[PDB]
Write an enzyme that holds these catalytic residues in place. Sequence first.
Site, short mmCIF file in Angstrom:
data_model
loop_
_atom_site.label_atom_id
_atom_site.label_comp_id
_atom_site.label_asym_id
_atom_site.label_seq_id
_atom_site.Cartn_x
_atom_site.Cartn_y
_atom_site.Cartn_z
N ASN A 114 -13.20 -10.86 -12.27
CA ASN A 114 -12.09 -11.71 -12.16
C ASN A 114 -11.23 -11.74 -11.01
OD1 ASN A 114 -9.09 -10.22 -12.29
ND2 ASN A 114 -10.52 -8.90 -13.11
N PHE A 118 -2.58 -11.78 -9.54
CA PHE A 118 -1.06 -11.74 -10.24
C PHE A 118 -0.79 -13.26 -10.51
CE2 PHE A 118 -0.45 -7.41 -7.94
CZ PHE A 118 -1.17 -6.86 -9.23
N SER A 185 -4.60 -3.02 -7.95
CA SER A 185 -5.31 -4.27 -8.24
C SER A 185 -6.25 -4.58 -7.11
CB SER A 185 -4.35 -5.56 -8.24
OG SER A 185 -5.13 -6.88 -8.34
N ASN A 187 -7.56 -7.47 -6.41
CA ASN A 187 -7.62 -8.92 -5.96
C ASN A 187 -6.27 -9.50 -5.24
OD1 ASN A 187 -9.89 -8.95 -7.65
ND2 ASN A 187 -8.84 -9.35 -9.53
N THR A 188 -5.45 -8.43 -4.89
CA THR A 188 -4.17 -8.84 -4.11
C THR A 188 -4.42 -8.28 -2.72
OG1 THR A 188 -2.73 -9.33 -6.05
CG2 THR A 188 -1.90 -8.87 -3.88
N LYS A 239 -0.76 3.46 -12.95
CA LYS A 239 -1.94 2.80 -12.91
C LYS A 239 -2.74 3.02 -11.48
CE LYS A 239 -5.06 -0.58 -15.05
NZ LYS A 239 -5.04 -1.87 -15.90
N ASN A 268 -8.37 0.63 -13.51
CA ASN A 268 -8.36 -0.95 -13.35
C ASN A 268 -9.58 -1.20 -13.16
OD1 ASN A 268 -7.57 -3.50 -12.87
ND2 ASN A 268 -5.55 -2.72 -11.79
#
Length: 376
Positions: A114, A118, A185, A187-188, A239, A268
């Site tokens: 994925n 966000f 995360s 993906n940021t 996390k 994560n």
Amino acid sequence: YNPEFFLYDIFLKFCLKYIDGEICHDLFLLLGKYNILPYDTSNDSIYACTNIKHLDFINPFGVAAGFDKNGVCIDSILKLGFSFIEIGTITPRGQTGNAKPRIFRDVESRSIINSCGFNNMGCDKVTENLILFRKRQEEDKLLSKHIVGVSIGKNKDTVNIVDDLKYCINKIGRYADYIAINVSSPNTPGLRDNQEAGKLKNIILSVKEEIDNLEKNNIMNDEFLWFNTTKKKPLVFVKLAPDLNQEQKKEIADVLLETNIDGMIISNTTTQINDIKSFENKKGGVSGAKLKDISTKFICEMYNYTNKQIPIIASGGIFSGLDALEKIEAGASVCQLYSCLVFNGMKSAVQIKRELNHLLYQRGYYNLKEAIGRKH
Ligand SMILES: Cc1cc2nc3c(=O)[nH]c(=O)nc-3n(C[C@H](O)[C@H](O)[C@H](O)COP(=O)(O)O)c2cc1C
Ligand SMILES: CCn1cc(C2CC2)c2c([C@H](N)c3ccc(C(F)(F)F)nc3)n(C)nc2c1=O
Ligand SMILES: O=c1cc(C(O)O)[nH]c(=O)[nH]1
């Protein structure tokens, strides 16, 4: 015996082969929005109840963040048979995410990749939704003991992480049972740089401080302020990402011990999987079974890094009752599921809950709490 489950499992095989991943996610959330998802109304085993300080979980299975990123489907998701849910990650202002071709699945490997970035409606709107749930909760007996956590993060364009985190705490704090800080995360762009001990320390202190600040400036009792399940101030979990060096992972632990963090979610998604042919040249973090063994060690690592002083929340490749026990024995107190619901479906919680109960019976454990840290 509730027939209302298998009706959905018929269409499950179809979805994995034909329907786009995110289209399946929106469809699922839509169903629960209209309260037409199955029900698991059987009492849970009192031997499986777990806790983290004054957080008391009826059973050790919730759904991880990113599932209901906006809390519009909490009532139905929980009624499937989960003790709690972690909504989010949320940011102060809404965000659209990234290129909508975001999430892809591989059935065989039971893996997901994925690159959402966000995508959420924003802190204010998601707060409206959670308020509605807490009111529904007070008038529903199938929600009376269930818990809601809120995962919080920063917008892609934010200049400083602490500012965004605080706006969320100060807007949605009263309605959260715990608050998970997502600084992991992949993906940021950036963000993971905040895992440095110095900035992470300041972050944790600021969040824990900000939650403590909500009590002082009130005119009413602490009983009415916290419109949550505990009626107490929300605990603070963090996390962590698995893509760290051992030196940073002991630095991390040092921060958690120093800052008195209430928990450590592990973990994560990862960016190190490169052996899925259908995922080649695709951006984003990987979830599912391929993340299982990697995260498990991270539990033993952080359970021994932190000297058993910080409870651990398990997330990563959890599909079966034995998978959960692996996470429990490594040092985890509770488990979260996501890909399991992607590949196993709505029958997941019931399935995995019966399997864990049965395994505790054969392994000789008197209750769940006895198993945390036992194959070390
Ligand atoms: C589509 C998708 C969105 C996610 N969004 C978030 C998120 O917003 N915040 C977060 O902390 N984790 C997020 N995650 C990570 C999951 O919460 C979880 O840690 C990971 O999927 C491992 O669980 P699993 O192996 O059982 O699937 C997301 C995962 C996926 C697949
Ligand atoms: C990675 C995004 N994400 C999420 C899910 C989870 C939301 C529940 C996916 C599912 C899920 N197991 C499912 C079952 C049944 C139905 C339907 F339509 F029958 F009601 N829809 C979705 N599926 C198959 N794919 C998912 C996905 O890609
Ligand atoms: O923490 C996170 C966040 C995202 C996302 O929003 O894209 N995705 C993940 O896999 N983990």
